[PDB]
Amino acid sequence: GPGSMSETSAPAEELLADVEEAMRDVVDPELGINVVDLGLVYGLDVQDGDEGTVALIDMTLTSAACPLTDVIEDQSRSALVGSGLVDDIRINWVWNPPWGPDKITEDGREQLRALGFTV
């Protein structure tokens, strides 16, 4: 179900096509569920700086302890980084704690300087 929708980001030409593509990977077209409709995903803040360009996305799941986290992270990060709109993202899972620690994804955790890991 496409249409002239408004994500506000990107020029109307680019946004339409790119979001149409993104919405294919960041949705459940199997049974037809759209996470955005849960109306927590309304909370997204993309902060750009000299350090980098990070898209923060406030999300939640049935119990936030489901292995669906990998799926949303992979599909979201994969597309968003490919769209070029943002390079860094962080999907945080909130159902109890204050928005902060939840925003530490595999990007920050595994590739922390203390680990010295580099891909």
- The pair of structure tokens assigned to 112 is 């922390």
The approach used to solve this structure was NMR
Q: CA Rg, the chain, in Å?
A: 15
> Counting Cβ atoms within 10 Å, is residue 109 exposed (0-12), middle (13-18) or buried (19+)?
exposed
Domain limits for position 117:
1-119
Residue of 36, 95, 43, 92 whose CA lies nearest to 69: 92
> Counting Cβ atoms within 10 Å, is residue 75 exposed (0-12), middle (13-18) or buried (19+)?
middle
* SS (HEC) of the chain: CCCCCCCCCCCHHHHHHHHHHHHHHCCECCCCECHHHHCCCCCEEEEECCCCEEEEEEECCCCCCCCHHHHHHHHHHHHHHHHCCCCEEEEEECCCCCCCHHHCCHHHHHCCCCCCCCC
Interatomic CA distance for residues 35 and 88, integer angstroms: 21
Interatomic CA distance for residues 23 and 29, integer angstroms: 9
Number of structural domains (the chain) is 1
